[PDB]
Each structure stands twice: as C-alpha cells, then as structure tokens.
Amino acid sequence: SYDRAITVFSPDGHLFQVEYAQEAVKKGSTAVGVRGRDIVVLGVEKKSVAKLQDERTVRKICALDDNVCMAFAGLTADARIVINRARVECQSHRLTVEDPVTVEYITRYIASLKQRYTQSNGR
Amino acid sequence: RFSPYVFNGGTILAIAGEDFAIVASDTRLSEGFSIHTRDSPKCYKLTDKTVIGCSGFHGDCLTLTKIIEARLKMYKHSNNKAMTTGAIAAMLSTILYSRRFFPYYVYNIIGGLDEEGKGAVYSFDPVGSYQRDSFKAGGSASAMLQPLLDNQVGFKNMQNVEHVPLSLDRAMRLVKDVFISAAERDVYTGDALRICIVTKEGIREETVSLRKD
Amino acid sequence: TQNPMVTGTSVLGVKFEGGVVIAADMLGSYGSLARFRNISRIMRVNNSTMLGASGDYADFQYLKQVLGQMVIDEELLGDGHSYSPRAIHSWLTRAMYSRRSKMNPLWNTMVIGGYADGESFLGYVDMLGVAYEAPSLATGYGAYLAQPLLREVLEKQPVLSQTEARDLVERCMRVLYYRDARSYNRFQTATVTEKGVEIEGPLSTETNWDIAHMISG
Amino acid sequence: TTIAGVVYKDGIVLGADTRATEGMVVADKNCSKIHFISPNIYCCGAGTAADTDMTTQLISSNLELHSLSTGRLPRVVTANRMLKQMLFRYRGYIGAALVLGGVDVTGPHLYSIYPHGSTDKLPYVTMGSGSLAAMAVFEDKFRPDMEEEEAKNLVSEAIAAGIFNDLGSGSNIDLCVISKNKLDFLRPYTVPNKKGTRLGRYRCEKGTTAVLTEKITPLE
Amino acid sequence: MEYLIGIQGPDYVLVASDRVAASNIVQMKDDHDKMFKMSEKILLLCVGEAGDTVQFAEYIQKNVQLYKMRNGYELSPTAAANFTRRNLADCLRSRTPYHVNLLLAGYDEHEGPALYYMDYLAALAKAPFAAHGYGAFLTLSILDRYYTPTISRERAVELLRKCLEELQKRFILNLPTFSVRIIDKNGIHDLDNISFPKQ
Amino acid sequence: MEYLIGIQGPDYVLVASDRVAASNIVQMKDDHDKMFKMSEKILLLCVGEAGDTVQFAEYIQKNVQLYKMRNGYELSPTAAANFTRRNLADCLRSRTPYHVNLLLAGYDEHEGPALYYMDYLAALAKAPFAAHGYGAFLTLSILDRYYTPTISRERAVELLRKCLEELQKRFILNLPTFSVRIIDKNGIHDLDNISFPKQ
Amino acid sequence: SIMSYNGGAVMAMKGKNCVAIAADRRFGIQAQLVTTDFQKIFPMGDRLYIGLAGLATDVQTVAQRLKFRLNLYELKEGRQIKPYTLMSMVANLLYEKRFGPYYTEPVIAGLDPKTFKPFICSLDLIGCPMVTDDFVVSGTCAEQMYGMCESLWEPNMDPDHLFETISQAMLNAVDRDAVSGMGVIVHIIEKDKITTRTLKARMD
Amino acid sequence: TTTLAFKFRHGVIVAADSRATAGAYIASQTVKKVIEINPYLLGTMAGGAADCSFWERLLARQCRIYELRNKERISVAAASKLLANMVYQYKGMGLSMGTMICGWDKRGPGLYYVDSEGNRISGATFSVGSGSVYAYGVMDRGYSYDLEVEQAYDLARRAIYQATYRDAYSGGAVNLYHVREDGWIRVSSDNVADLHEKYSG
Amino acid sequence: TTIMAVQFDGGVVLGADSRTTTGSYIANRVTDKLTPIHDRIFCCRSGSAADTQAVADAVTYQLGFHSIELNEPPLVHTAASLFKEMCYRYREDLMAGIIIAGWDPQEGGQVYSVPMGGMMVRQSFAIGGSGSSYIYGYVDATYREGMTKEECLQFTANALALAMERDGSSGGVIRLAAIAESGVERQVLLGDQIPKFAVATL
Amino acid sequence: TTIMAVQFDGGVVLGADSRTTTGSYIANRVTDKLTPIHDRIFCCRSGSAADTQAVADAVTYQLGFHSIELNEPPLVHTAASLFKEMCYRYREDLMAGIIIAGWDPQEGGQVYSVPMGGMMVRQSFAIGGSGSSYIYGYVDATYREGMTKEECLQFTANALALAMERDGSSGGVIRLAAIAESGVERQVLLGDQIPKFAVATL
Ligand SMILES: [Mg+2]
Ligand SMILES: [Mg+2]
Ligand SMILES: [Mg+2]
Ligand SMILES: [Mg+2]
Ligand SMILES: [Mg+2]
Ligand SMILES: [Mg+2]
Ligand SMILES: [Mg+2]
Ligand SMILES: [Mg+2]
Ligand SMILES: [Mg+2]
Ligand SMILES: [Mg+2]
Ligand SMILES: [Mg+2]
C-alpha cells in the first residue's frame, strides 16, 4: 500500500493540497442555496447546456436520503464518491440507530470524511 | 481429557463498619482430598486502604492478583494518584468480564475505606457482577458464615433488639466465631485464620488458629 | 500436550538449615511399562536453584531447554544480576499458567529447590498454574505417602540438618517404592547450599520384605 | 476415613478416625467405625456407612448364632469367609471396605476385605480415603511382635497421619486391642481436635423470637 | 408461532400475518408486525429466529432503499426477491447464517402482482398463494380448494377469512389478530385487522 | 396443554378444566372433559400423559364405587384422596407408573368442602385453591391476590372468570372453552361452560 | 438433584430435660410454592416426634409406612416405643430399599418414655443413623443450618432458651435457601408438656 | 428474579425484586435490578447479573458519547437498538440477558424489551424473570393506561410482591421507579416482610 | 501380575510375583498368588482378586467332594476342567487368567492354561498376567526340553524376575512351589535372592 | 513393527522387520523400515507410515543443508535433535516411534530414542514398535557390554526374530545395517536365515 504523506504543512503553516483542492472547487459551476421557512432552494449555475448532452446524466443536484439532499461544486468524479458515501451512511444510521438521519449529522459526516482525506497517507 | 480448572477451597469474609473494614480468610489450600499447604491466606494488600481476598481456583487468583497490581501502578503513573477502593472495584469488574467466555473461576471480596473515610465491602462473582455490602462471605464456607451474620450483624429475625453499630471489637469476634464454627463443618476450612483490618491508621494483621483436620 | 506419553512419577523436596534437597527416581514410565530406567528428572537451573519434574518427560525436557537458554542468556551479561529461586519459580508459574490458558498444557508438576541469602526456597507448580511455597513438597503419589511423613516430622521439629533431612528423604523414597506401582528403586538426590547445586548418582534403598513370610500366620 | 490394624506379639490393634461426611461437609464429628463382631473379633468399616453397618451387624448376628450352636468361640476365617462371600455376591454394590481383626484358638488374625469381595491376610493394613497416609506410618515404623503399647501407638499415629492429611478424615482416634485374654475397646483413645473457644456471645434471650401461634398439651 | 399468508390476484396481492410475539408460554406483545416496507410497491413478510428476522429484514430493507437513492428508480419486486435470495443464500454457508422464512409481495407497473416464497435455505419460488408456519399446514389445502387465478380482492379477503377462522378452530396456538395488507398499482394499502372476540 | 383449577369456599368447591384434546399442532376434540365422578360428593380432576390419565382415573373411580357397594356408604373425600395417593405413590416405583397430575374436589356432610392437589410423584396436599398446567403459572398469583376464605360461589365464579380471561390474554395455547362444576351439601352440579367468542 | 425437588429443612436440638424439633412449611415443585401448610414433622407417640425432609412423596410415604410398623410394635409389645428403638426401626425400613431408596433423611427428637433422657438423631436415605448430644439437620440448607448451630447452641438449656435458640437457627438458615421457608414451626417437648408454635417468618 | 415495566398516562413504571441466587442458595437480597442507565433512561436486570450490568453500562457510555456529539438525548428506540445490536453479535455464546429499556422520548413514554436471544420489541407492559408469569397475572388484571399515579405504584409494587410469593427465586425488597418527562424518580423500596404486613396485615 | 508354570518329569514348578494393585497403588506387595486347590494341585491367579479368590474356593470345594466321593487322588485335568467350566460359563462376569499345575498319580506333572475366554489347553509351560507380555521372547529362547526340577525352578525365577523389572503391575517378592509325587515344597525369594540383571550404562 | 539399534565401539547395528499392516491385512510384507538420513546416519521407523516417511524426508532435507552449509559430516546428535524437534512440536498430530543410530567422527557410534511424546534419550541399545514389548525381558537378560559388530548384529537378529514370532503386527524379512567410519553395509535375512526357536511340544 502507498503510504506517502500527500497533504503536509508548509513553512508558514499552510496545507497546499487543501488550498489546491479549494482551487478546483473555484473552477466549478457556481451553485447557490437559500434557506426559507417552507421550502429551501438550490440552483446549479454554468450548466454548459451543450444540448448534444443529456440533462439527467449530469445534474449537479442530488438527494442523499428522504429528508436530505445536496449540491456541489468542483471535481465531478470526486463528488460522485462523496455523494454515494453519504447515501450509504444514511441507510446505515438507520440500522445502528432506528431513527433517521439528521440535518447536521450527515453534514458532519461528510466534513469528517473530507478532513480525514487531508491527513491520511496515500490520499 | 483436560480441565483447565481446579477447586482449592478456602473461604473469604468481610465486614464494613462506620470507620473500618475487615477481610478474613482461612489459610488452607487444598485439592482433591489433600492439603497443598496449611499456610496460604487469601488476603492481599492492594493500597493503604484497600484489601482483596480471592477464593476458588488458585491458578486464577494468582494471575488475577498480579494483573490487579500492575494495573494500579499504571493508574498511578497515569493520574498521579492511587486508586480509590471504588475505582479498583469498578476496574476488577471489567477485568473479570474480559474473560466472560473463559471465566476466572474466582470469587473476590474487596475490603477497604471509601474516599469519605468510611468502611466499604464489595463482592464479585467470577465474571464481574458486583455490588457493595455491609458484610459478605464467598467460598466454601460461604453458606455457613452468612446466616449467622444476617442475624448478628443485620439483626434479622430478632424482635425488639438494639441496633447498635458494629463495634470493631464485636466484629473481630464475630469473624473469629463463624470461621471457628465453619472450621467444624467444612473440610476445606481449617489450619488458621488470618484477618486484615483496614482503618485510617492503616492495615493491621492478626492470625487466629484453627483445627488442622 | 493433551495426552502424556513417557512420564515420571512423584518428586520430593524438603528444606534444611542452609539448603534444600530434592529427590526423584530415574524412571520414565510409558503407561505401566518401566521403559526408560535411567533418565534424570532433576535439573540444575544456575547456582542457587534446582528443579524436579513429575509428568510428561518430553515437556520437562522442553522446559529444561528454555530454562537453560535463559540462564545462559543471563550469564552473558555478567552484569552482576542473576535469577533467584523465587524468580525461576515465578517465571515457571507464569509459563505453566499461560499454556494452561491456551488449553495446551505442559503436563508437569514441579518442585523448585533453592538457596539464596541464607534463606531456603522450596516451591510447587502445577500444569494449571497453582503455585505456592512450603517447607516440604511431594507430588504424585508422594503427596499421599511421603508428605504425611514429612509433615509429621516437621510438626515436631521445624529445623532439620542436611543429614536429618537426607535421612527422611531416603525413608520416604522407600515407602514410595513399596506402594507406588510406577516408582523405581533407583533415584537421585539434589541438594542446594551456599556451595551450590549438587546431584547424586544412581542411589537405592534397603528394602525389607520379611512380611512376605507371614502368609499363613 | 482412615482405618487400620496391626498384628503384634500378644494380639491385635484396630484404629479409626471418627469423621463422617455428607459430601464435603462434616455430618458427624464422632462416628463409631470399629464394629463388634464376636467377643474376640472386631471390624473397622470404611465406605458407605449404612453398608458397613448392616454387613457388619449381619455377620456378627450370624456368628452369635453360629457359636451359640457349636458351643465354641468364633474363628476369624469364618467372619472373613462370611463377609467376603456376601460382598462378592453383590459384585461391589455393597460399598464396604473392612479391616477385620480378632484372636482365635489359632491366634490373632488380621484380614482386609474389599467391597468386591477379595481379602488380604496381612500383619498390618489400612482402608479408606486416609489409607495411603496411614500406610506410610506403618511402612516406615513397623516391627513384628511389637508390645501392646509399642503397637497401640503405631496405630494411633497412622490414624493420625490420616486425620490431618486427608480431608475425608478428622476428629478422634478410636482404638481396639484384642489379645489371648483381653479386649480393650478404647473409645476416645486420643482427641487431637478441639472446637475453638467461642470468642463472642449470641445466647438468644427469651422473647427475641416473634411467634405467630402457640399451643400446649399436658402429659402425665 | 408465526404465521404468514399471501394470495396473488390478477392486479394485486393480499398478504397477512399474526401479531403475536411469543416467548415461553406467554404472548409478550399483542400487536406485533411481521411486515417490512422495502419499496412503495414491495413488502417483505419475515418470520423465524429471535434476532435473525429483524436484523436480516432491515438489512435487505436499507439495501433496497440505498438502491433507490443511487439510481433514482426502485427495484422490481422480482429483482428484490433475487437480491434477498442472493444474500440469504450467501450467508447460509457463512459464520452468520440467518434463520428466516419469508414472503415477498410486490407490484410492478409492468409485470403485475407477484408473490414469492423463500426457504431459510434460500430456495426461491414464485407462487399464486403461499404460507409459512404451522398454520400453513392447516390452511394451504383450503386455498388449493377455493383459489382461482382471477379471485378478486373481495373474494381474497374472504378466502383469507376462511384460513384465519380455521386456525381459530384447529390450530392450538392462540393467534387472535392478523395484520392485513394489499398491494396494487397504487402501492401498499393497510386494512383492518381480522380479529376474534376472545377476552 | 391441559389446565385444571379449583377454589374451595366455606360450604362448596368450584372446579374447572379446559375442553381441548391436543395432538401435534391441532385440537382433536372441541369438548373434552377432564373430570371424573367418584362419589355423589366427589370429583377427580385428572391431567397428564395420553393413556395414564383415563386408565388411572377410572381405576381409582371403579375402586371407590366398589367400596360403596361393599359397605353401603361412600368414602369421605379425604379418604379418597389418600386412597388415590396410595396407589399412585405405589405405582411410582413399579413397572406401571402413572404420569398424571390431579385435583380431588369433594364435600363431606361433616367435614365440609375440600380441595386436594397431587404431584405425579404422589405428593398430597390440601388447599383452599390450586391449579395444574402452564395456566397455573399465569393464574395462581391472581387467586392469591383476590381469594378470601369466605368468597361466595358468586365471587368464586368471578375469580375463576378472571383467571380464565388471563389465559385468553397471556397464554399462547388456544383454550376456548372451560367445563365448570360446583360441589356442596347437595352434590355435584354442572354449570354453563365459560366460553369466548372466537371462530 | 432429586432431594432438592420439593426443598425443605428440618432440625432437632437437645436441651437439659427437653427436646426441640422444627421444620419449614413450604411445599413446592422447583421454583413454585404450592402450599404453606405442609406437615413434615409427625407424632410417633407422646414425647417422640420424627421430622422428614426431602422428596414430598416419600416424606408422606415413609411416615405412613412407619406408623403402620410403630402401631403394631406397640400392640404386640405391651409398651410405648423407646427413641433408640424407633431410630433402629426407621433404619430398617429405609435400608429395605437400599437399591431404590426413599428420598428422605429423617430427624428424630424425643424423651425416653420411662426416663428423662432427651434423644435426637438423623439418618441416611438408606438408613444409616447418627446420634448426637447437640443438634442434627436435614434438607436443602444443611450448610446454612450447621452455620447457626455451631454458633448458637449451648450445652444445657431450659425450654425457653432452647426454643429461642432453635427458632433462630431455622429462620436464619432458611432465609438463605430459596426453596426452604414460607414459615417455620417448632415443637418443644418437656416431660410435662408439648409446646407448639409457628414462628413469624418471611414469605418469599 | 421478577421485573416489570408498563407505561401509562404519567410515563413508565418499573419495579423489581432484589434476590440473587446461586442454585438454591440466596447469595444476596440487596440487588439493584433497576439499572440507573442515565438520569433519563432505565434498564432492568434479569438472566445474568454481570451480563446485564456490563452491557447496559456500555450502553450508558454510548448514550453519553451520543449526547455530546448531537446535543440531544438519544431516543429510547435508538438506545434499545444499540443494546440489541451490541448483544446480537454474541447470539449463541451464552450471554443471558432479559431487560426492559425505559424512558421518555420526543415520542412520549417509551418501553422496550431486549433479549440476548435477539428480541427487541416495544410494548405497553412487560414482565421478565423466573417470577414473571406470576407478575403478569396480577398486573394484567389491573393495568389501565389511565391508571392514576398512586394507583400505578400499588399495582406494580403488588405484582412484584405476589411473584416473590410463588417464585422461589424472587424475593428480598421491592424496588419501584417512575419515569417522568424530565427524569426518573426512585419512588419506593420496601422489604417483602413489611409489604406482607400490609397486603394482609 | 506375572504367573508361570513349568512341567518337569515327576512334577511341576509354579511361580508368581506378589504385587496386587488398584490403579497405581500397591494394596499388597506380599500377596500369595499360588493357591492350593488340593493336596497336590495348585493354581496361579491373575485378574480380579475377588474373582480368582471366589473361583478358587469354589473349585476347591468342588474337588474336595469329588475325591472323598471317589476315595482317590483327583486328576490335575479334572481340577483344570472345574475352573474351565466356571470360567467359560461366567466368562462375561469374570476377569480371571488362570494356570493350573500339579501332580497326578495317573498323568504325572501337568500344566493347564485357562485364560480370559474360558478355553483350556495343556502346555509344557505356561505364562499369564500383565507382565507375561515382556517375557515371551525370553521364555521362547530359553525353554529347553528336558529341564530338571532345578533348571525349571530357576528358569521361572529368571522369567518372573525380568517381567517384574519391566511391568509396573508386577513386583514384590517371587514365590515358588514345586510339586511331585513326594509332596509340595514352597519357597520365597526376597530382595537379593531375586535374579538380577545390570541396567545398561555407558 | 519391531525396530532396534545397538551401539558397538566404532559403529552401530540397526534392525527392523518388514511388516506394515492396515488392520490385519499386510499391505507390504517387504517394507524397508531403515531409512538413510545422511551418509552415515540412519533411523528406524515405527508408527504411521505416512508420518514417519514425511518426517524423515523433512529431516534429510534439513540435515543435508546443514552439512553443506558447514562443509562437514553432521553429528548423530544433531540428526536426533531434528527429529525430536518435529516430533515434539507436532506430537499431537504425529504417530512416530523413532530410533536414530549412526556414526559420528566426533562421538563415534550412537543410538538415540525419540518415542511418541517427542522426548529424546541416548541409549546403549534401543527397541521400539508394537513387537518390542515381547522382547524386553529377552533383551535385558541378553545384552552384554562390550559386544562386537558381530555379536550385536546377531543379538538384534535374535530379538527381532523372537518379536516377529509373537507379534501379528511384525513379520516378513529381517533387514539389518551396520554403520561405522568405514561406511554402511546393509543385509537381509530371508526365510531360513532368520533365527529359529522350536515351538514347545510334548
Ligand atoms: Mg453529456
Ligand atoms: Mg486434553
Ligand atoms: Mg497466602
Ligand atoms: Mg483432615
Ligand atoms: Mg436468485
Ligand atoms: Mg451477510
Ligand atoms: Mg396418603
Ligand atoms: Mg397399579
Ligand atoms: Mg407427645
Ligand atoms: Mg426462602
Ligand atoms: Mg420466593
């Protein structure tokens, strides 16, 4: 197994691999979200309507559970991975506990996944 | 085939008074219909205010004892203080439970003082189930000693009696009596009876004699 | 070991003024067959401690192997430190217990004899890990035929001399020969004193069979 | 139990502890283990108490009936025969291990009988859980033709070895000496075991026990 | 002891189960539910050993749900049955085998109503009607006797009514109430429990 | 599984039993009677093994009757219980032991009402109220709870009614109907069966 | 085990010119109580009682069959059975079933019919007898009972200090035995009277 | 052992005897079979003493972590579900556990029965232990979701007592707890000796 | 146990050890395993002490009556037959390994073996008991036809000595007995008298 | 099986029968139970054929490497140790009764026994296998200190002959082998060549 340390601190205390990741997010299709009181909304910008495309197979909007969903901006492939990992955690939070997944809980989970990947060898 | 257990006998008793705790055990170690040694007390000092007595399979009592000793040292290095009688009891519980599926054939009784200075006694079953008591006995004479204490120390089955506190003096003789009576009916009890007294002043030992038969 | 094969019967040990003595016949039985009549079931573990083993001879040879390396190891350091009788007895108890806990015991009951700091050491160890110290020790049948005699003597004279003791051992090794069907009247005697560990060649005991002529009467 | 017997110059000596146990608990601190067969024959019993009793009582009874007809005094071989042939017949189910001893027109005889029915004619024997301990005493300190006192104590020493070294034995040491003209049935012969002196008081004072019902009845 | 029954009609599937949770000689629960919601058009009727039923059922459950979230569309009742069969049969020779017997009732907006039966050994079979438990022995003959490939849900609830009465008659196990449910093009619809006037 | 209950009042004795004859998983008889007529003031409630119950019961029965014909007068319920106990206990260590548990309810025009309980081991005990079968476990506590040495037969039939409802609730065995009977200075009187509205 | 099927405890004590005998009252089948008024002590003549512990059926049977024999003995002999003789009578009845014994270990307590002599003994389920000058126990709490006895018994006791002693031994032993209890009964026999009291005890 | 719990209008009642045996020998009668999991969750002790104490203590640990991580008390279902899960892994290994997990959720009074056999069910009332069948008897004849607080106390306390009567392995003192929306309260603790000289005294 | 019997012209030699154990404990190290059945007939016993003792008394009783009834010395073959009858008949309930040797005015010196099964066979010399297994090869390479009451009496002494050496179930003292017309002479070999063989060394 | 080895001054003698059975059927009446471990080291095998064969190949492999690595003749004691290590370590899964004998430039002729348990002991001469029980007494009364490669070679021939006579599990032909500095010479004793002893008659 590959153990190299990919994300490391620099002279002034920076984590470039993270700052670079953050840059890839910047080069992504804008995405906004607003919290109402009866309906929360989200819209994905620069959808580059190439028309020869196919709407469904590329919507930067996804549902994770029956009470949660998400939008993302950045490397397309990565999002997929993270999306389907939260999806799994959603159903597993119901097998361990009986109640469903919370608003924050699932978000925390995703954050924890990302944070981990900034401090694990090989990744 | 091969059993990894043996019954060595020996009983253990303990009482807790306002300001003292007593832990007693005969000193006979046997196997089969024989006696390994007449001088093998089951009482051991853990700290300056905590004593433990172990009966059952001597192989396990020995191992268990050495495990407890080491773990206290660890706790000390780790928290900079000695373990309170209550924490030792809580710990011993988990240690016994780690062998839940291959039990330490052991009946332990912890006798000492709680942080508040009062006397304390904790009894355990081989897999860690425990609680605190005023007095308790485990081991072969177990069912022989108890009844007399329920009566004398618990004033049970007695109408219009004086619920006077167990004077350390009266205790010390109750201990010697039940063990002397037990030594009469339980082939495992005999030879001698060592007592360990735990107080604010420390731990003091006394060895009374019993039938060598 | 799940099934002992070639075994050695009882082992005796009593302490005296300035030393301890151990006795063990030289028989390696295979069931009821006196198969190996000339094997030593005693071992010298460094200058202040000796060991005697009952049970599976193969396991005993094993312990003898590991203990020998241990002593050698320690001697290499020549750091002025060396296992004491209690130490060897302690290690053995940990070892025997460890194996018993893996359900794969070393089928032996052993007597550890030692002398260090003007004090006499005598320790017992089971294959189950039961261990203890006492003035006299007898395993196997010896625990039913020899230990009652040994105690009898000591309950009336706690202190024996190397000679008074060797007298008792010989008497016991005789009773054992008369009653233990798997004993052999050809043993060894090991002694430990400030001078060290000494093992004595093939010995035997005067046996008296004059009751044989009392069939009729 | 530890029972033993020895053959000395003038007769025989029988020993026996006095402990009886129900499992690993002492039921009787003073059981009588040396049984009477004939006036010149005694038997120690080890094993199933009840069996040791009834078999011993029966042979006794049958011998009192026997000598009551022959007009002579019972012989040891006869007790031995009767006993062994019965025990054998029960293939070991009558758990009686016996140490038979007595004096004949033919002299002092000491037999050991096992529950399955075999017997041993020997100058000294032991039976019971403490038999190996006792036998040690004998094998180490036995001499032929000992004097009454020189044997009378070798036996109490072997019954002692048993008492302390075998959890199945304890309490008192009873003895029995039978010679060409004497029969000393020394019940307590030694008593090396005493109940420790009560260090407290518990006497229940009248009134401490709450009662729920009373009823008296006068006799005459 | 647990009872499960299912009758497939031409456009729906009716299924029922008892509501007793037995232990020793006593009923520990008056209203126990043997059915599990997998999809909007699928139910898994599960009975068996103390922990194996729930554990397994919910496991197949959450995994069917996960499929929904990952692809957007649900699994066909036919595809779920082969799924659950795959797992049960794969655990059969594992360290964690599940001792459960079950019924999988579902409706496909393309294939129609479907009722599946399954052995704790993981043998899978499709069938017009089926049952599990000792009750099955006393009631499968009735269904063979009155079942028609066209029985309407009015009839079905009556055929069920018959089987259920039979148990109140011959079966020696209490079994007072029975959860009932139907599945058609419009999903899973409850129904009143079939109950019997016993104290 | 068979249930027997008896409550002794100050002037009578009320007794009841189920009417199911079980075998395997089915009730083979809807109206089975666990009671046997010994005298005009005596009943023997018998339960147990397949042949042992009838065989033994009738044996003690015909022998009590024989006593009547031989002496003119009947046996006191107290004397019958010691009779039946003698035989059962005498067969216990025989080649033909009887595996039966029973209740002996009777009235003596001199001693009053009496209820006896008996172990298949032949242990005999007199008692104000008693039961046999698994039902006993779920109902003896009730009786301890509501029984008074003076309960009247109106009360008794109600206390019984309680125990019987409990079985319809906690017990897992069907048990729909229960034969009921009373015994007083005027003999053995039947009573309506306590039944429950189950199909 | 067979002996602890119905549970139970029985005890006898020796005073100066009196004797005591007590027994719990529970009649149960394993965990379940069935009766609270179960007799385990039976009158075998005036100043002579036998206490039976163990398996309920044999308790009743051994007692009934023993009475049978006791009555005839008294009708043939022109007297009232002597304790040492009733003991030998039960020892014979039990041993006749040596290879299929009754499961009960009897306790005998009484006074000589023509003397002061207090007498107590207990037996094997197969008839081996034991006579002592202090006490005897039988039942599922032999151990608990020995405990009390070796710490409460005094050589000579007047009827009242005997009653209070045997009553304490029972109630306290029986309270550390799950299948013994539900009340205790005591019998104190004096050359002149028979005092019978049912002590106040736990009912669990 | 005899334990029980039922929930009504005013929460959940939980009672239990205090006897512990070793074969027929009464080893103790001061056993606290109502395990004070959290000041908001209660558990019972039936089957193996150590088995129940250990796992539920572990559950207490898990609940506390949960609370610290979600700034919310864990739901009764969730808690009981943790316990069920922890225990299921060892099914077949001999753990012996019969317990009722009680509390007050965002769903109201909560009561779950959990086994070492794998069972885990929500119910109105539950009795566990060797003396359970007896307790059921009196409890069933007297249980109403509308019972008044002081009425519910008598019932539960009575049920356990009646059991200590018939079941030889139940006895000692009778413990009683009441689970209210805020937290649980330790209602009473009376010896059986006393309770007798009252139910009939 | 180790028993053995040899036939020489006008008589027989019989030998046995004196060990009788129960497990590994020697309950008698001086047992007398050569039992007199009749004036000049003996049997060696191995197996259950109770069984061999009980059987021997029975045969002695049977034979004593037979001879008085015939007023004649009993045949050795007869004594063997009486053992064989009981040992075959009760083969499922006995554990007896018997050898019968003695002198016959009609057949002279003879030795019969009656092992476990209950079979009976006459032999030049016989060996039985646990220890016997260790002395077959010996006995096969040493037995000589035509030995004397002395050579024989010494031959069994060696065989029993060897066997006692290797078998835990055998030991104690060696008892012997020679029977011939003249009568019966029994001797014993204690300690040193017992043949010895040096335990192999370096 | 019956195996045996004897030590004489400059070497050793080794003998074994050739019988290997499965139940009561002889699957090989000509088995070669003396296996070469190294140029001048041999072992006799008794027990599970599969076990003794597998173990011997293993030791041969182990020893062959050890010697080349040291460029020296291996010690007999070493070869014994390698068997003892495997036989002790896997004592619960092997059924091997082994004897190792051979010549050592450093210790000369030697014989080691490694029985079932896995123990190892050096002896003047050793015997193993089922048949060994019948030749203890023989071997004890015949072994002489100071025998010659000839006396010895004949001594085992008798012992193996006797044993083969009484043990069903032993028989066939007697294989021998003598090892001394000079080398190793193996011979066989068919039919008549096998020592004989007259079966006792009238
Ligand atoms: Mg596209
Ligand atoms: Mg094993
Ligand atoms: Mg100590
Ligand atoms: Mg003793
Ligand atoms: Mg499939
Ligand atoms: Mg799986
Ligand atoms: Mg009767
Ligand atoms: Mg009949
Ligand atoms: Mg009277
Ligand atoms: Mg109780
Ligand atoms: Mg109770």
How would you explain this protein's 3D organization?
Chain A is α+β, with helices and mostly antiparallel strands. Chain A contains three helices and four strands; from the N terminus they run αββββαα. Chain A has a two-stranded antiparallel ribbon with strand order 1-2. The longest helix of chain A has 21 residues, at 76-96. The N and C termini of chain A lie close together (11 Å). Chain C has a single domain, classed as Glutamine Phosphoribosylpyrophosphate, subunit 1, domain 1 (4-Layer Sandwich), CATH 3.60.20. In chain C, 31% of the residues lie in helices and 32% in strands. Chain C has five helices and 13 strands. With 220 residues, chain D is an alpha+beta fold. Chain D has five helices and 13 strands. In chain D, strand 5 (34-38) and strand 6 form a beta hairpin. The termini of chain D are far apart. With 204 residues, chain G is an alpha+beta fold. Chain G has one domain (1-204): Glutamine Phosphoribosylpyrophosphate, subunit 1, domain 1 (4-Layer Sandwich). In chain G, strand 3 (27-29) and strand 4 form a beta hairpin. A five-stranded antiparallel sheet of chain G has the order 10-1-2-11-12, covered by helices on one side. In chain G, strands 5-6-7-8-9 form a five-stranded antiparallel sheet, with helices on one face. Chain G contains four helices and twelve strands; from the N terminus they run ββββββααββββααββ. Chain G has helices at residues 56-76, 83-95, 142-152, 159-173, and strands at 9-14, 18-24, 27-29, 32-35, 41-43, 48-51, 107-111, 118-123, 129-131, 135-139, 184-190, 194-198. Helix content of chain G is 29%, strand content 28%. In chain G, helix 1 (56-76) crosses helix 2. The chains are: A alpha+beta (123), B alpha+beta (213), C alpha+beta (217), D alpha+beta (220), E alpha+beta (199), G alpha+beta (204), H alpha+beta (201), I alpha+beta (202). At the D-G interface, helix 1 of D face helix 3, helix 4 and strand 12 of G. The complex binds magnesium ion (11 copies). Chain G: Belongs to the peptidase T1B family. Chain G: It is found in: Cytoplasm; Nucleus. Chain G: Pfam families: Proteasome (PF00227). Chain G: This is Proteasome subunit beta type-3.
Biggest interface, CB < 8 A: D-G, 34 and 37 residues
- Rg of chain H is 16 Å
CATH superfamily of chain H: Aminohydrolase, N-terminal nucleophile (Ntn) domain
CATH topology label of chain H: Glutamine Phosphoribosylpyrophosphate, subunit 1, domain 1
- What is the overall number of helices of chain I? 4
Summarize the amount of helix of chain H as a percent range: 25-40%
Coarse structural class of chain H: alpha+beta
Note the beta-strand portion of chain I.
Answer: 25-35%
Total strand segments of chain H: 12
Order of helices and strands of chain H: EEEEEEHHEEEEHHEEH
Shape of chain H: globular
| Strand elements of chain I, count | 12
Structural class of chain I: alpha+beta
Bound heterogens, unique? magnesium ion
Q: Would you state the CATH class of chain I?
A: Alpha Beta
What count of helical segments of chain H does DSSP give? 5
Q: Looking across the biggest beta sheet of chain H, what order are the strands in?
A: 10-1-2-11-12
Name the helicity range of chain I: 25-40%
